[model samples]
Target: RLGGVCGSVWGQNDIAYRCRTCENDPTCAICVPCFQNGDHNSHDYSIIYTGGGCCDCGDETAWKPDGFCSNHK
Candidate 1:
Protein backbone atom coordinates (compact mmCIF):
# COMPACT_ATOMS: atom_id res chain seq x y z
CA ARG A 1 0.00 0.00 0.00
CA LEU A 2 2.86 2.32 0.80
CA GLY A 3 3.80 4.35 -2.29
CA GLY A 4 1.47 2.03 -4.16
CA VAL A 5 4.15 -0.68 -4.26
CA CYS A 6 2.50 -2.98 -1.75
CA GLY A 7 5.85 -4.68 -1.16
CA SER A 8 9.53 -4.21 -0.48
CA VAL A 9 12.92 -5.48 -1.54
CA TRP A 10 12.48 -8.40 0.87
CA GLY A 11 9.33 -9.56 -0.85
CA GLN A 12 7.20 -8.23 1.98
CA ASN A 13 3.64 -7.89 0.76
CA ASP A 14 1.83 -5.72 3.31
CA ILE A 15 1.58 -2.38 4.97
CA ALA A 16 4.16 -1.22 7.56
CA TYR A 17 3.26 1.68 9.82
CA ARG A 18 5.33 3.51 12.48
CA CYS A 19 5.49 6.80 14.41
CA ARG A 20 7.10 8.79 17.23
CA THR A 21 6.26 11.45 19.86
CA CYS A 22 8.43 14.17 18.40
CA GLU A 23 6.45 17.23 17.32
CA ASN A 24 8.76 17.74 14.36
CA ASP A 25 8.05 14.17 13.24
CA PRO A 26 4.77 13.38 11.54
CA THR A 27 2.58 11.00 13.51
CA CYS A 28 1.77 9.05 10.36
CA ALA A 29 5.36 8.95 9.10
CA ILE A 30 7.72 9.94 11.88
CA CYS A 31 9.06 7.04 13.93
CA VAL A 32 13.54 3.15 17.03
CA PRO A 33 14.61 0.94 19.81
CA CYS A 34 17.48 0.21 22.22
CA PHE A 35 17.86 2.11 25.51
CA GLN A 36 18.36 -1.07 27.47
CA ASN A 37 21.34 -3.24 28.45
CA GLY A 38 23.52 -0.46 27.13
CA ASP A 39 24.14 3.33 27.09
CA HIS A 40 21.08 3.95 24.89
CA ASN A 41 18.85 3.34 27.89
CA SER A 42 18.83 7.08 28.47
CA HIS A 43 17.60 7.78 24.96
CA ASP A 44 13.85 8.03 24.52
CA TYR A 45 12.91 5.75 21.63
CA SER A 46 9.36 5.11 20.51
CA ILE A 47 7.78 1.77 19.72
CA ILE A 48 8.86 0.55 16.29
CA TYR A 49 6.05 -0.75 14.06
CA THR A 50 7.36 -3.62 11.97
CA GLY A 51 4.58 -4.80 9.72
CA GLY A 52 5.25 -6.56 6.40
CA GLY A 53 7.58 -4.32 4.44
CA CYS A 54 11.07 -3.30 5.49
CA CYS A 55 12.28 -3.13 9.09
CA ASP A 56 11.09 -0.12 11.07
CA CYS A 57 14.73 0.90 11.44
CA GLY A 58 15.18 1.17 7.69
CA ASP A 59 11.73 2.54 6.93
CA GLU A 60 12.11 5.32 9.41
CA THR A 61 15.83 5.98 9.18
CA ALA A 62 16.05 5.49 5.42
CA TRP A 63 18.71 2.82 5.89
CA LYS A 64 16.90 -0.24 4.61
CA PRO A 65 19.05 -3.25 3.89
CA ASP A 66 19.42 -5.00 0.54
CA GLY A 67 17.44 -7.99 1.79
CA PHE A 68 14.56 -8.78 4.12
CA CYS A 69 13.62 -6.82 7.18
CA SER A 70 14.44 -7.73 10.79
CA ASN A 71 11.30 -9.88 10.89
CA HIS A 72 12.89 -12.28 8.42
CA LYS A 73 15.96 -12.72 10.57
Candidate 2:
Protein backbone atom coordinates (compact mmCIF):
# COMPACT_ATOMS: atom_id res chain seq x y z
CA ARG A 1 0.00 0.00 0.00
CA LEU A 2 1.12 3.57 -0.55
CA GLY A 3 2.81 5.19 2.42
CA GLY A 4 1.38 8.69 2.06
CA VAL A 5 -0.99 10.95 0.17
CA CYS A 6 1.59 11.54 -2.56
CA GLY A 7 1.33 7.91 -3.63
CA SER A 8 -1.36 5.44 -4.65
CA VAL A 9 -4.25 4.51 -2.37
CA TRP A 10 -5.68 1.26 -1.02
CA GLY A 11 -9.44 1.21 -1.07
CA GLN A 12 -12.31 -1.17 -0.25
CA ASN A 13 -15.70 -1.38 1.42
CA ASP A 14 -16.44 -2.35 5.01
CA ILE A 15 -20.09 -1.68 5.56
CA ALA A 16 -21.74 -4.38 7.67
CA TYR A 17 -24.24 -6.82 6.27
CA ARG A 18 -26.05 -9.56 8.12
CA CYS A 19 -25.82 -13.07 6.78
CA ARG A 20 -28.95 -14.53 5.30
CA THR A 21 -28.66 -17.60 7.53
CA CYS A 22 -26.67 -16.52 10.58
CA GLU A 23 -27.47 -12.88 11.21
CA ASN A 24 -25.73 -12.44 14.57
CA ASP A 25 -22.23 -11.96 13.26
CA PRO A 26 -20.87 -8.47 12.77
CA THR A 27 -19.53 -9.16 9.33
CA CYS A 28 -18.42 -6.82 6.54
CA ALA A 29 -17.48 -4.08 8.98
CA ILE A 30 -14.63 -1.90 7.76
CA CYS A 31 -11.50 -2.19 9.89
CA VAL A 32 -10.84 1.56 9.83
CA PRO A 33 -11.12 3.34 13.15
CA CYS A 34 -14.21 5.45 13.52
CA PHE A 35 -13.50 9.10 14.26
CA GLN A 36 -16.03 10.52 16.68
CA ASN A 37 -17.49 13.87 15.57
CA GLY A 38 -15.47 13.25 12.39
CA ASP A 39 -12.56 14.85 14.23
CA HIS A 40 -9.41 13.39 12.69
CA ASN A 41 -6.79 14.08 15.32
CA SER A 42 -8.45 17.44 16.05
CA HIS A 43 -7.71 18.63 12.53
CA ASP A 44 -11.27 18.95 11.25
CA TYR A 45 -12.29 15.69 9.62
CA SER A 46 -15.05 14.87 7.14
CA ILE A 47 -17.08 11.67 7.15
CA ILE A 48 -18.36 9.70 4.19
CA TYR A 49 -18.78 6.18 2.84
CA THR A 50 -15.71 4.04 3.46
CA GLY A 51 -15.95 2.38 0.07
CA GLY A 52 -13.12 4.41 -1.43
CA GLY A 53 -11.86 6.94 1.06
CA CYS A 54 -8.25 7.44 2.13
CA CYS A 55 -6.98 9.29 -0.89
CA ASP A 56 -3.45 8.37 0.05
CA CYS A 57 -4.32 4.78 -0.62
CA GLY A 58 -7.31 4.95 -2.90
CA ASP A 59 -8.00 3.55 -6.35
CA GLU A 60 -9.23 6.31 -8.65
CA THR A 61 -12.05 4.17 -10.03
CA ALA A 62 -13.49 3.81 -6.55
CA TRP A 63 -13.23 7.45 -5.55
CA LYS A 64 -16.23 9.07 -3.91
CA PRO A 65 -17.32 12.65 -3.26
CA ASP A 66 -16.87 12.66 0.50
CA GLY A 67 -13.82 10.40 0.51
CA PHE A 68 -10.60 12.30 1.01
CA CYS A 69 -7.10 12.14 2.39
CA SER A 70 -4.19 14.55 2.76
CA ASN A 71 -3.67 14.61 -1.01
CA HIS A 72 -7.34 15.00 -1.79
CA LYS A 73 -7.71 18.57 -0.60
Candidate 3:
Protein backbone atom coordinates (compact mmCIF):
# COMPACT_ATOMS: atom_id res chain seq x y z
CA ARG A 1 0.00 0.00 0.00
CA LEU A 2 1.01 3.63 -0.46
CA GLY A 3 2.31 5.77 2.39
CA GLY A 4 -0.35 7.69 4.34
CA VAL A 5 -0.11 11.10 5.92
CA CYS A 6 1.04 9.45 9.12
CA GLY A 7 4.26 8.26 7.46
CA SER A 8 5.82 5.64 5.27
CA VAL A 9 4.07 2.67 6.80
CA TRP A 10 1.57 0.11 5.69
CA GLY A 11 -0.66 -2.54 7.24
CA GLN A 12 -3.18 -5.16 6.34
CA ASN A 13 -6.01 -2.68 6.95
CA ASP A 14 -4.97 0.90 6.44
CA ILE A 15 -7.16 3.71 5.12
CA ALA A 16 -6.92 7.31 4.00
CA TYR A 17 -8.64 9.99 6.06
CA ARG A 18 -8.56 13.78 5.91
CA CYS A 19 -8.12 16.68 8.28
CA ARG A 20 -9.42 20.20 7.60
CA THR A 21 -6.74 22.05 9.55
CA CYS A 22 -3.60 20.20 10.58
CA GLU A 23 -0.91 21.78 12.71
CA ASN A 24 1.83 20.01 10.77
CA ASP A 25 0.51 21.67 7.61
CA PRO A 26 -2.82 23.31 7.06
CA THR A 27 -2.49 22.39 3.43
CA CYS A 28 -2.01 18.77 4.45
CA ALA A 29 -4.80 16.40 3.57
CA ILE A 30 -4.95 13.12 5.50
CA CYS A 31 -3.14 12.32 8.71
CA VAL A 32 -4.45 10.40 11.74
CA PRO A 33 -2.29 12.11 14.35
CA CYS A 34 -3.12 15.57 13.02
CA PHE A 35 -6.80 14.85 13.27
CA GLN A 36 -6.42 14.27 17.00
CA ASN A 37 -5.04 16.58 19.70
CA GLY A 38 -5.13 20.38 19.21
CA ASP A 39 -3.78 20.14 15.70
CA HIS A 40 -7.12 19.91 13.98
CA ASN A 41 -9.00 21.00 17.06
CA SER A 42 -12.46 22.40 16.30
CA HIS A 43 -11.67 22.08 12.62
CA ASP A 44 -14.10 20.45 10.25
CA TYR A 45 -12.95 17.35 8.39
CA SER A 46 -14.22 14.42 6.34
CA ILE A 47 -13.64 10.64 6.23
CA ILE A 48 -13.60 9.45 2.65
CA TYR A 49 -15.25 6.02 2.57
CA THR A 50 -13.34 4.24 -0.14
CA GLY A 51 -14.76 0.90 0.98
CA GLY A 52 -12.18 -1.70 1.92
CA GLY A 53 -10.58 -3.50 4.85
CA CYS A 54 -8.57 -0.33 5.34
CA CYS A 55 -11.64 1.50 6.59
CA ASP A 56 -12.01 -1.04 9.36
CA CYS A 57 -9.63 0.52 11.81
CA GLY A 58 -11.42 0.90 15.15
CA ASP A 59 -13.75 2.91 17.38
CA GLU A 60 -16.16 5.11 15.39
CA THR A 61 -16.31 7.57 18.27
CA ALA A 62 -12.87 8.94 17.34
CA TRP A 63 -14.00 9.79 13.81
CA LYS A 64 -16.85 11.95 15.08
CA PRO A 65 -16.76 15.69 15.69
CA ASP A 66 -15.16 14.93 19.06
CA GLY A 67 -12.05 13.48 17.38
CA PHE A 68 -10.93 11.36 20.32
CA CYS A 69 -10.17 7.87 19.23
CA SER A 70 -8.39 5.09 21.12
CA ASN A 71 -5.12 5.83 19.35
CA HIS A 72 -5.52 9.59 19.73
CA LYS A 73 -4.13 11.87 22.35
Candidate 4:
Protein backbone atom coordinates (compact mmCIF):
# COMPACT_ATOMS: atom_id res chain seq x y z
CA ARG A 1 0.00 0.00 0.00
CA LEU A 2 1.66 3.19 -1.17
CA GLY A 3 1.22 6.24 1.06
CA GLY A 4 0.27 9.79 0.18
CA VAL A 5 2.33 13.01 0.17
CA CYS A 6 2.07 13.06 3.97
CA GLY A 7 3.29 16.62 4.52
CA SER A 8 2.84 16.25 8.26
CA VAL A 9 4.73 18.47 10.66
CA TRP A 10 5.65 16.46 13.70
CA GLY A 11 5.81 17.88 17.22
CA GLN A 12 7.56 16.87 20.38
CA ASN A 13 6.64 13.28 21.44
CA ASP A 14 5.42 12.45 17.92
CA ILE A 15 7.84 9.91 16.58
CA ALA A 16 9.33 9.93 13.06
CA TYR A 17 11.46 7.62 10.97
CA ARG A 18 14.75 8.62 9.34
CA CYS A 19 16.19 6.61 6.50
CA ARG A 20 19.95 6.91 6.39
CA THR A 21 20.06 5.05 3.11
CA CYS A 22 17.62 7.52 1.52
CA GLU A 23 18.85 10.96 2.47
CA ASN A 24 22.13 12.60 3.31
CA ASP A 25 20.87 14.70 6.20
CA PRO A 26 19.94 13.37 9.61
CA THR A 27 17.18 15.87 10.28
CA CYS A 28 15.06 14.71 7.38
CA ALA A 29 12.39 12.14 8.21
CA ILE A 30 9.05 10.65 7.21
CA CYS A 31 5.84 9.83 9.03
CA VAL A 32 5.16 6.34 10.33
CA PRO A 33 2.65 5.49 7.61
CA CYS A 34 4.95 6.76 4.87
CA PHE A 35 7.86 4.80 6.22
CA GLN A 36 5.84 1.67 6.78
CA ASN A 37 4.29 1.58 3.33
CA GLY A 38 7.30 2.83 1.35
CA ASP A 39 9.97 0.67 -0.29
CA HIS A 40 12.68 0.85 2.34
CA ASN A 41 13.47 -2.80 2.78
CA SER A 42 17.07 -3.56 3.88
CA HIS A 43 17.60 0.19 4.13
CA ASP A 44 19.40 1.79 7.04
CA TYR A 45 16.70 3.63 8.98
CA SER A 46 16.14 4.93 12.51
CA ILE A 47 13.50 6.52 14.71
CA ILE A 48 13.21 10.17 15.65
CA TYR A 49 11.69 10.75 19.08
CA THR A 50 10.37 14.04 20.47
CA GLY A 51 12.12 15.91 17.67
CA GLY A 52 9.62 18.24 16.08
CA GLY A 53 9.95 18.19 12.27
CA CYS A 54 8.08 17.66 9.07
CA CYS A 55 7.73 14.53 6.92
CA ASP A 56 9.96 14.46 3.85
CA CYS A 57 7.80 12.33 1.58
CA GLY A 58 8.11 14.50 -1.50
CA ASP A 59 11.39 16.13 -0.80
CA GLU A 60 13.76 15.43 -3.62
CA THR A 61 16.75 16.31 -1.47
CA ALA A 62 15.46 14.32 1.46
CA TRP A 63 14.81 11.17 -0.49
CA LYS A 64 16.45 9.36 -3.35
CA PRO A 65 15.01 8.65 -6.80
CA ASP A 66 11.60 6.93 -6.61
CA GLY A 67 11.52 7.45 -2.87
CA PHE A 68 8.69 9.96 -3.08
CA CYS A 69 5.25 8.73 -2.01
CA SER A 70 2.28 8.23 -4.33
CA ASN A 71 0.64 11.54 -3.42
CA HIS A 72 3.87 13.45 -3.61
CA LYS A 73 4.61 12.15 -7.05
The model with the greatest lDDT is 4
The 10 consecutive residues of candidate 4 with the worst lDDT sum are: 1-10
Report the C-alpha lDDT of model 4 over 1-73, residue by residue, as the tens digit: 3443457988888998888888758777888877876788898888779368788887786777466655576
- For all candidates in order, the CA lDDT equals 0.29, 0.28, 0.37, 0.75
TM-score of each: 0.21, 0.20, 0.30, 0.79
Candidate scoring better on TM-score of 1 and 2: 1
Q: Show the colliding residue pairs in model 2.
A: 9-57, 9-58, 10-57
Give the local distance difference test score of model 2.
0.28
Candidate 1 lDDT over 9-53, as tens digits, reads 223333333423312243322112211211222334454443433
TM-score of 2: 0.20
Candidate 1's TM-score: 0.21
Clashes of 3: 0
Q: Residues 1-73, candidate 2, lDDT per residue (tens digit)?
A: 2432223222565332112121122221111332221123433233334454232222233322133333332
Candidate 3: which stretches are off by over 4 Å?
A: 1-6, 10-13, 23-28, 49-73
lDDT score at residue 16, model 2, on the 0-100 scale: 20
Q: Model 4, which residues run further than 4 Å from truth?
A: 1-5
Clashing pairs in 1: 35-40, 35-41
Residue 44 miss distance in model 1 (angstroms): 1.6
